[PDB]
Amino acid sequence: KKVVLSSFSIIGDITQNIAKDLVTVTTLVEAGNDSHSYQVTSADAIKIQNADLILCNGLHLEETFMKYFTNLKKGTKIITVTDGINPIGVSDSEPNPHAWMSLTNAMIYIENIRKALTALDPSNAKKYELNAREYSEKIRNSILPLKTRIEKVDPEKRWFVTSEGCLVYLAEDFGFKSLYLWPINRSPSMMRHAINQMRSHKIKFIFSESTNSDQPAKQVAYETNASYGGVLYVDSLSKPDGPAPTYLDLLRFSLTKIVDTLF
Ligand SMILES: [Mn+2]
């Protein structure tokens, strides 16, 4: 039985829905850790040796631990599952890694993982084909109604404001503008800028996220006369009893919370 190692929980969950136990799906940065601050362990090196295929986000998400993907099993490839996604920069600059926060991009992650699994395990092509389409429609069925309601927002309430720049791909996909305090899980000028921008556009809400502090968002809410919108799930699946234990649940939770704020 082949073993497919995903770099973090969001990719591991997508892969599990495409492979459904045809392969063993493992995860390096488990739910609760972010990629942004992950220490590769000895036991992790075992997961890395056992991998027949390694699925990374790319867009520099794994930059600090790419050096551990070395001395690999012969024949083991590293596949970047964001292939085909036009990068959004962090400033000409380093890419923003959060491409999975997008309904369009969900379909591209699924397609790239379907393609990689099928090249790895061609005798199950028909099953990965079927599973990928079923899962793409599951995502569409849950998420498209959220998109539909949020597209009703008045064109000057079209702002997603967060702490980390975790929604830039969502903004691009749905036609909104972004504002945030720092691109990747911090600087005084970016905070000053967000405060100014919120005041000039009369922005009503700012969120924080499940792996970072709520204090800068609450502070900005105060200074701008906006409201703190609460916590979004964007960088990691929640624990099993939390609200975002799967990638579908994560998109559904965070987009629900955004749309519920904008109306
Ligand atoms: Mn992040």
Nearest to 106 by CA among 259, 263, 249: 249
CA 166 – ligand 1 centroid, Å: 6
CA 210 – ligand 1 centroid, Å: 10
**137 annotated as ligand-binding:** no
**235 annotated as ligand-binding:** yes
Tell me which H or E stretch contains 182.
Answer: none
Tell me which H or E stretch contains 89.
Answer: none
Report how far apart the first and last C-alpha atoms of the chain are (Å, whole number): 49
**164 annotated as ligand-binding:** yes
d(CA 260, CA 232): 12
d(CA 202, CA 181): 17
- Determined by X-ray
Q: What is the resolution of this structure in A?
A: 1.8
**193 annotated as ligand-binding:** no
Domains of the chain listed by start with CATH number: 2-151 (3.40.50.1980), 152-262 (no CATH)
d(CA 184, CA 255): 20
